[PDB]
Amino acid sequence: EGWPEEWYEGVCEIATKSPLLTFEPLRSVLTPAELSELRSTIINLLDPPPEVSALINKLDFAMSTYLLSVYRLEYMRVLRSTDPDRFQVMFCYFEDKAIQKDKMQCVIAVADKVFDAFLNMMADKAKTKENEEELERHAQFLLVNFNHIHKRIRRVADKYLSGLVDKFPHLLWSGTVLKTMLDILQTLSLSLSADIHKDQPYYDIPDAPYRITVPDTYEARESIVKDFAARCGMILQEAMKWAPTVTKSHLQEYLNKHQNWVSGLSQHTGLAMATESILHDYSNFMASLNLRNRYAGEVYGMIRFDLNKMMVQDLHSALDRSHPQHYTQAMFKLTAMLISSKDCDPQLLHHLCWGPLRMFNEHGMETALACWEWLLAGKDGVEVPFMREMAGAWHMTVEQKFGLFSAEIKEADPLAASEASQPKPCPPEVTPHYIWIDFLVQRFEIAKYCSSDQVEIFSSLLQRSMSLNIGGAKGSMNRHVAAIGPRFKLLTLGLSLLHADVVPNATIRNVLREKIYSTAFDYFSCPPKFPTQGEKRLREDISIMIKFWTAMFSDKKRGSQLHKYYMKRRTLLLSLLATEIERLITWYNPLSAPELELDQAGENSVANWRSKYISLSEKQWKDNVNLAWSISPYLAVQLPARFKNTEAIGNEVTRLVRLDPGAVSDVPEAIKFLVTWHTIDADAPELSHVLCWAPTDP
Amino acid sequence: DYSNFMASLNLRNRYAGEVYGMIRFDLNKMMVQDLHSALDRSHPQHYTQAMFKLTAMLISSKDCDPQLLHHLCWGPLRMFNEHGMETALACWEWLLAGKDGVEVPFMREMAGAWHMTVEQKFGLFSAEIKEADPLAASEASQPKPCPPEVTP
């Protein structure tokens, strides 16, 4: 392509329907300078290893012309075609006897380039649904031919499979590849011991149109089965290394197939491979498996004789009576009934998603998480409606101020607690959000590679939770110390979403970053207090804070105005977080206790930043107070409490509050920056309108 | 060799759950009819399902219910293959492991069934058939081995 231009389009359309240049002796059927020129062009186009070029240099006109014609036709067809069997048509050129007799390497050389071109074309098609099915089918076709009876075929198939699997990582934890792998392994094992001198060495594969041929001698058979038994294990361990829960649930679902039960009394090495892989924290595995099987059987027994009414009423009665066991039984029966049907039946899904909201405990949340995992792993094409319902339920929880978003209750002070209301801690209790956020994190991690529609749902869910209202008593989030886990975990998830290069445009990112910064600053607008949770549940909070600190540090991406506007606040947040982490880890263990340690990597960076920010001078330090007052007065007021060994902070804060004292009317500590116009100088009786302030301790 | 473990466990759990679902609403008649129909039609899956449901029903009750035990023991004798024998052995193992104080009546019934098999000359006790000789059987009675089959 490069005369009438429409001729090239006609040529492309012809190639879109042209047959294969198949072929009975080959060579008998078909100026040195021109031969040298065409050989040079072929070598330049193919770029083969030197041995293949040396083989090529011994060819006549006709063979080179045939190779070039094959190259052009196959390249054009694979580029401009629409058949879903794009790249497997090239394999048919390997199944011709006539080519196998000539004195292969050229064919595989051109096939490599064709496959690379197809892969490059498909790498950026879209992120829709059916492309995943196409990729899975291609992977299956690669897998079945991995053990062909020839020699070069299986090694080139292995190379192609390695390339495909290292370009598309999400295929490892797919729900269709593993089934075919295990079925093929079982068929090979059944073929291993089959009375060698029988006939028809062909074999079949269930629920897939294919066939398998085996060699004769026993040593070849055991060699091929031993060779195939290694890739399965290596990729199983690789998949379990990254995303354990999804593959664990897939294995659990595969283990419960009814057909394999009867033959289970035979060898059936596929199940043995699965159970050995999963074992090589085993309680929840078997518990979930047994519960799933038993309740599916119960539902199938009940359906022997519409019907949603009795389980709906059972769930309602259990919730009204507050009976945990009836609750779990009803939820499991409901999801078992839903998983075995032909239609979505939306009211069942709505009741499943809004069930736990009437019983907000750890037990109910664990049961709901298990049921949701089973439902997600069981049915097909039900992701987006379930995600929509879950987002709706989460936003309802946000609206009603249930847990982390609950209101705030002030506690008494010891200095004036002599009245019959004695002091005692009253911390909030947020267990369920702590696990809900983990579920959301793992689901988002999968959906980032898998699809491109749940990303909008996640963005909407995150955007409608935080707010830019750093201030007195309105932040849409509790400020107690006992609830710093879920807050920073959610902020870290938001940062990770921002760093994944998913949101297309450049105005949503500004809003998201601004909201994240606003919430992070809002957390630091209260007097410091010491943690009240137990010895456990405290280490992981420090770990989460360290992770968020590292993620914040790594972030570095009218231009200049925004650049400085973000950099300064990044520096301030880094300093504040370092100070908070140091104080918390100090309170953790009083003595040094080298036996009781934490993560070592980030601590060194935190200490180095501590030294760097402690090494500054009196200037460029009186301006941080100005920046804090620009952000919000309350943070500036609370700044000296987080001790910094410099008296300039106090003087600057005193000057700022004396300039205008009406902004701050928080009783305890703000008046001490104003009540002393001068400690002993005893002059200037002006601007002292203390009649607006609130009462303090006696 | 771990497949038998999981297979037995899953079958036990699933069929116990199915029986518990069925009992929610006597009831031995339909189970006996299902077993009889499966035996008459010579269908393996119905056979295994009926036997497992029968032993699950028996294992959760308050009395021996002798006809159920007799039908359980005298069941495989009308389907004498390795499939039926494997199913019966699994069911017998589950029944022995599950219910307390049922050893001797089951042993009595099984011994009775074994003696019935002995007396009817079914397998190892079957009659002997004289095979042809190669020297003087050139006619349509060609010499073909005809060994007996005793798997169960």
DSSP secondary structure letter of residue A695:
P
Secondary structure (3-state) at B135: coil
Contacts of B4 in chain A (CB under 8 A): 264-265
Give A301→chain B minimum CA distance, Å: 5
Tokens of A133: 């099915």
What are the distances in angstroms from CA A549 to CA A489, A580, A671? 11, 11, 34
A296 touches chain B (CB under 8 A): yes
Tokens of A481: 């110390």
A340 touches chain B (CB under 8 A): no
Residues A633-646, buried b or exposed e (16+ Cβ, 10 A)?
bbbbbbbbeeebeb
**Residues ≥6 apart with Cβ < 8 Å to A125:** A131
Tokens of B71: 């039908």
- Closest by Cα among A473, A476, A509 to A494: A509
- Output the CA angle A468-A474-A479, nearest 5 degrees: 100
Contact B10 A255 (CB under 8 A): yes
| Calpha distance A291→A285 (Å, rounded) | 10
Contacts of B15 in chain A (CB under 8 A): 297
Q: How many C-beta atoms lie closer than 10 Å to residue A35's C-beta?
A: 14
Residue whose tokens read 């890739």: A231
Contact B3 A265 (CB under 8 A): yes
Contacts of A267 in chain B (CB under 8 A): 1, 3
Rg (CA), chain B: 20
Tokens of A667: 């009783």
| Calpha distance A508→B27 (Å, rounded) | 66
Helix A454-463, helix A383-400: angle, nearest 10: 0
Helix or strand run (H / E) with residue A211 = strand A211-212
| Calpha distance A393→A458 (Å, rounded) | 14
Tokens of A414: 């010891």
Tokens of A468: 């830019």
DSSP secondary structure letter of residue A405:
T
> Which chain B residue shows the shortest CA-CA distance from A299?
B21
Secondary structure (3-state) at A204: strand
**Residue B128: left if φ>0, alpha if ψ -120 to 50, beta else—which one?**
beta
Residue whose tokens read 């090529």: A56
**Residues ≥6 apart with Cβ < 8 Å to A369:** A435, A439
What are the distances in angstroms from CA A429 to CA A197, A365, A482, A532, A534? 71, 14, 8, 12, 13
**DSSP secondary structure of A492-516:** HHHHHHHTTS---SSSHHHHHHHHH
Across the interface, of B2, B19, B44, the residue whose CB is closest to A275 is B2
| Calpha distance A57→A292 (Å, rounded) | 66
A277 touches chain B (CB under 8 A): no
Residues A204-234, buried b or exposed e (16+ Cβ, 10 A)?
ebeeeebebebeeeeeebeebbeebeebbee
Contact (Cβ atoms closer than 8 angstroms) between residue A397 and residue A405: yes
Contact (Cβ atoms closer than 8 angstroms) between residue A335 and residue A352: yes
**Residues ≥6 apart with Cβ < 8 Å to A10:** none
Contacts of A269 in chain B (CB under 8 A): 3
| Calpha distance A246→A449 (Å, rounded) | 14
CA A268, distance to chain mean position in Å, is 34
Report B:81-100 residues touching A (Cβ under 8 A): 86, 90
Residue whose tokens read 């070039």: A68
Contact (Cβ atoms closer than 8 angstroms) between residue A446 and residue A239: no
Helix A485-498, helix A454-463: angle, nearest 10: 130
| Calpha distance B9→B15 (Å, rounded) | 10
Contact (Cβ atoms closer than 8 angstroms) between residue A68 and residue A44: no
Facing residues of A203 across strands? A212
| Resolution of the experimental model, in Å, one decimal | 3.5
- Closest by Cα among B48, B78, B60 to B22: B60
Length of chain B counted residue by residue: 152
**Residues ≥6 apart with Cβ < 8 Å to A267:** A189, A190, B1, B3
**Residues ≥6 apart with Cβ < 8 Å to A27:** A63, A102
Written in H, E and C, the secondary structure of B30-64 is: HHHHHHHHHHHHCCHHHHHHHHHHHHHHHHCCCCC
Give B20→chain A minimum CA distance, Å: 7
Rg (CA), chain A: 35
- Closest by Cα among A384, A573, A395 to A491: A573
Tokens of A409: 């209750």
Largest CA distance in chain B: 71
Could you list the beta-strand ranges (E) of A55-97: none
Across the interface, of A256, A264, A297, the residue whose CB is closest to B3 is A264
- Output the CA angle B77-B80-B85, nearest 5 degrees: 90
Contact B10 A293 (CB under 8 A): yes
Contact A305 B25 (CB under 8 A): yes
Contacts of B8 in chain A (CB under 8 A): 264
Experimental technique, in short, is cryo-EM
A580 touches chain B (CB under 8 A): no
- Closest by Cα among A29, A256, A654 to B11: A256
Tokens of A149: 């009876």
B55 touches chain A (CB under 8 A): no
| Calpha distance B83→B69 (Å, rounded) | 20
- Closest by Cα among A156, A21, A134, A144 to A85: A134
Helices (H), strands (E): how many in chain A? 30, 2
- Closest by Cα among B69, B70, B79, B77 to B47: B79
**DSSP secondary structure of A271-287:** HHHHHHHHH---HHHHH
| Calpha distance A656→A502 (Å, rounded) | 43
| Calpha distance B42→B88 (Å, rounded) | 16
Contacts of B25 in chain A (CB under 8 A): 305
Contacts of B56 in chain A (CB under 8 A): none
| Calpha distance A301→B14 (Å, rounded) | 10
Cα four-point dihedral sign A185, A190, A195, A200: negative
| Calpha distance A546→A551 (Å, rounded) | 9
Across the interface, of A255, A294, A298, the residue whose CB is closest to B6 is A255
Across the interface, of A256, A266, A301, the residue whose CB is closest to B22 is A301
| Calpha distance A629→B86 (Å, rounded) | 83
B20 touches chain A (CB under 8 A): yes
Tokens of A15: 């190639």
| Calpha distance A697→B93 (Å, rounded) | 78
Largest CA distance in chain A: 119
Tokens of A19: 């047959």
- Output the CA angle A652-A654-A657, nearest 5 degrees: 110
Contacts of A297 in chain B (CB under 8 A): 13-18, 21
Contacts of A304 in chain B (CB under 8 A): 21-22
| Calpha distance A493→A254 (Å, rounded) | 32
Helix A601-614, helix A559-588: angle, nearest 10: 110
A307 touches chain B (CB under 8 A): no
CA dihedral B28, B33, B34, B36 (to 10 degrees): 130
- The stretches of A256-382 forming alpha helices (DSSP H) are 259-263, 269-279, 283-302, 308-321, 324-339, 346-353, 362-378
A310 touches chain B (CB under 8 A): no
Across the interface, of B3, B13, B15, the residue whose CB is closest to A268 is B3
Helix or strand run (H / E) with residue A611 = helix A601-614
Secondary structure (3-state) at A588: helix
Across the interface, of A267, A271, A302, the residue whose CB is closest to B6 is A271
- Closest by Cα among A217, A75, A93, A81 to A156: A93
- Closest by Cα among A432, A546, A516, A525 to A479: A525
B59 touches chain A (CB under 8 A): no
**Residues ≥6 apart with Cβ < 8 Å to A607:** none
Contact B19 A301 (CB under 8 A): yes
CA dihedral B48, B54, B60, B64 (to 10 degrees): -140
Direct distance between the N- and C-terminal alpha carbons of chain A, in angstroms, rounded to an integer: 92
Contacts of B19 in chain A (CB under 8 A): 301
A268 touches chain B (CB under 8 A): yes
Across the interface, of B2, B8, B11, the residue whose CB is closest to A272 is B2
- The stretches of A209-268 forming alpha helices (DSSP H) are 218-242, 244-255, 259-263
> Which chain B residue shows the shortest CA-CA distance from A268?
B3
Across the interface, of B13, B25, B48, the residue whose CB is closest to A293 is B13
Helix A244-255, helix A362-378: angle, nearest 10: 70
- Output the CA angle A112-A114-A115, nearest 5 degrees: 65
Across the interface, of A261, A304, A305, the residue whose CB is closest to B10 is A261
Q: How many C-beta atoms lie closer than 10 Å to residue A632's C-beta?
A: 19
Q: Let me know if B12 is exposed, middle or buried by CB neighbors in 10 A (0-12, 13-18, 19+).
A: buried
**DSSP secondary structure of A446-492:** HHHHH-SSHHHHHHHHHHTT--S--SSS--SS---GGG-HHHHHHHH
| Calpha distance A532→A534 (Å, rounded) | 7
- The stretches of B1-146 forming alpha helices (DSSP H) are 3-23, 28-41, 44-59, 66-73, 82-98, 103-120
A299 touches chain B (CB under 8 A): yes
Q: How many C-beta atoms lie closer than 10 Å to residue A495's C-beta?
A: 18
B37 touches chain A (CB under 8 A): no
Tokens of A592: 């040094």
| Calpha distance A204→A691 (Å, rounded) | 92
Helix B82-98, helix B3-23: angle, nearest 10: 70
| Calpha distance A464→A511 (Å, rounded) | 12
**Phi/psi at A84 (5° precision):** -65, -5
Q: How many C-beta atoms lie closer than 10 Å to residue A66's C-beta?
A: 16
